What we know:
The complex is a heterotetramer, with two copies of chain A and two copies of chain C. By secondary structure, chain A is mostly helical. Chain A has a single domain (1-142), classed as Globin-like. Chain A is built from seven helices and no strands. Chain A has helices spanning 4-16, 21-35, 54-72, 77-80, 82-91, 97-112, 120-137. In chain A, helix 2 (21-35) crosses helix 3 and helix 6 runs antiparallel to helix 7 (120-137). Chain A is globular. Chain C is an all-alpha fold. Chain C has one domain (1-146): Globins (Globin-like). In chain C, 70% of the residues lie in helices and 0% in strands. The radius of gyration of chain C is 15 Å and the shape is globular. Chains B and C meet through helix 2, helix 5 and helix 6 of B and helix 2, helix 3, helix 7 and helix 8 of C. One protoporphyrin IX containing FE (HEM) binds next to helix 3, helix 5 and helix 6 of chain A. One protoporphyrin IX containing FE binds at residues 39, 42-43, 45, 62-63, 66-67, 84, 88, 92, 94, 98-99, 102, 133 of chain A. Chains A, B: Heme b 1 binds at residues 45, 88. Chains A, B: GO terms for molecular function: haptoglobin binding; heme binding; metal ion binding; organic acid binding; oxygen binding; oxygen carrier activity; peroxidase activity. Chains A, B: Heme b 2 binds at residues 46, 88. Chains A, B: This is Alpha-chain hemoglobin.
Amino acid sequence: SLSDKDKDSIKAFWAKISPKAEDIGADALARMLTVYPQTKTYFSHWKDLSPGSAPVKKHGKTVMGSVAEAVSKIDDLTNGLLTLSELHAFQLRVDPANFKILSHNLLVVLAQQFPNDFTPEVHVSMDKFLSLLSWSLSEKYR
Amino acid sequence: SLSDKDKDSIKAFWAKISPKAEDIGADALARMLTVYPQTKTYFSHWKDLSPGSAPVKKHGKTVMGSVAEAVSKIDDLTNGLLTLSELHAFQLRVDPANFKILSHNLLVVLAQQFPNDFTPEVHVSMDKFLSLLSWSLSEKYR
Amino acid sequence: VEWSTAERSAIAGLWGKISVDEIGPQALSRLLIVYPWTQRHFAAFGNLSSPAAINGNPKVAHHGKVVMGGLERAIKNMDNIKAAYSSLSVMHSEKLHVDPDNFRLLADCITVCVAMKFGPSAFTPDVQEAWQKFLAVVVAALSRYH
Amino acid sequence: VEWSTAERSAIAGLWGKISVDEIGPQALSRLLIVYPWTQRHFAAFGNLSSPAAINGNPKVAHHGKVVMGGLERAIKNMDNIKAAYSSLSVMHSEKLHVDPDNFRLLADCITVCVAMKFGPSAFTPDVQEAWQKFLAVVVAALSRYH
Ligand code: HEM
Ligand code: HEM
Ligand code: HEM
Ligand code: HEM
């Protein structure tokens, strides 16, 4: 699915945003949790589900950190992501449907923060990046 | 993405299934058309859309011969399918939603005609195969 | 929803040949094996860890009969299915937070099992059409009611 | 469906700031660019051949306004949305055969353009929460009536 234009367009995008990666991770994660309260069932061991809370800020930073790794290995996602895929299918057994939800909250936050830079054409490429990302995360489920 | 165990189940199943492949294609296409009439709009230029009609039978052998090659070519589904991505995703702007409706009618038909063989374990691998094919047809969307 | 008499009759006649013992445990197993994440809602059931374990699991089997039991309720209430599934809906979507896509996957597992049992003669396009419409109502009614 | 008075006022303050003439055309343009299969439902429109043509197309624009008008109709009838949409449902189900997943995609592109316009201080999690419950009622109500 990712074309050479998606790569350039998302790589360039990553460089702009991303000083603010942790921000985006905590803004996207905490939004998913209140907006879609069915994703809460997976993190109910935390302290602290609300927007801005420490567990969200800390888990936000991680999510966006592995999305950075994924962008550096964008030509071999299929490799960069397979271990996250064993963990999500097998130890956490996250319903694949939830991935679409995080990625929407993530397009929302990009763009809420960089409106500026989130043309419909950048939106295309980002959204394809993140379906690819879900598609690779799905590798290990069955 | 297909594991080496998936290819085997599919190559194997195809070897069992392939004599009846015209009728799998006829039965699948025309159950799609009647059970999900939303799909009928894509074929409005055919004379007859009813099950068993001539255009239905002719087009079903076509779907399945292309499914035939993708099985032959199952290590490299992309190059193997790209021809058909452009058709479906660029020219006909087929809703990606219908890809799963077809693959479902496919499964129902395969299991209906070969219950013997259609174990949940064959089913997972065929399902995965059909989604890969969908993912491959999705390339020229955008 | 209004059911033609063609549809009612197609639906009651399909239903009346279903072995609920049998179609139940097949549907659920196929579901746990084809859509493995769904195993998460069913951690009460034990092992689970492989195809043979799943359908060698006595509780799966027994819950598959319960699923078919729910489908019957809808059969006996098909003019008011939503009202009939009212507490089912609460349970699945207020209290188990099963994603709605899973109801379609189960429904699809059922349809394959029934098609496997019955063959083309049997499970004709017209019969599938009305069966499909039945599952779609069951599935909407199991989802959060607005 | 029950609204909180927090929801009610969140929805109403947000809608109150939306320029329908701006967000409407913008949200429809973004759907046809980001999910371009969706162009086939609108091939009476032009000239959907590229992002530029989409943004310059008068029927796209007009129709983005008309979509915001569907939303405004749900706004004024928040306790009875399903009934307000009954004709709309029929036209999008029984007549256009728009696969429901598309109504989700448009609602998402709407959200994105709202977020982009208001930024972090106005497009608060709690606001998004209530906006989203609202769009999920709309989408539901658009969305086949079983
Ligand atoms: C873009 C999608 C995602 C990425 C890149 C991602 C990445 C991660 C990472 C990097 C971890 C920590 C791994 C470690 O501890 O070594 C984690 C854990 C986790 N994720 Fe995800 N994740 C994603 C989506 C999701 C979604 C949609 C859900 C479900 C709502 C989810 C549920 C969880 C849970 C419950 C944990 C464990 C947190 C804990 O320690 O309790 N994840 N993920
Ligand atoms: C495995 C998923 C699918 C596969 C392998 C597939 C395979 C094929 C093949 C080989 C062709 C021949 C195209 C040509 O040379 O004209 C074709 C054509 C076509 N397909 Fe598909 N197809 C799939 C899904 C769909 C779906 C889900 C729809 C619409 C619901 C669709 C609508 C069409 C149409 C309208 C044509 C033109 C038919 C004609 O004009 O004769 N396809 N497909
Ligand atoms: C075809 C649609 C479905 C129907 C008709 C159905 C029906 C039922 C019924 C009748 C019960 C017993 C409820 C009671 O005690 O009164 C039940 C329980 C339950 N359902 Fe479903 N269900 C459906 C889909 C699903 C799906 C997709 C899931 C999750 C992946 C699920 C998860 C559960 C669980 C976890 C229980 C309680 C099990 C226990 O006894 O521990 N159901 N359902
Ligand atoms: C939030 C979701 C939506 C709302 C509130 C909405 C609302 C409306 C309204 C108010 C109309 C004008 C009705 C009339 O002429 O009487 C309309 C028509 C129409 N809708 Fe939607 N709509 C929605 C989503 C969609 C989606 C996702 C599609 C599929 C891509 C779609 C396709 C169309 C088409 C093609 C027309 C007719 C254009 C014409 O013939 O002039 N709509 N809708």
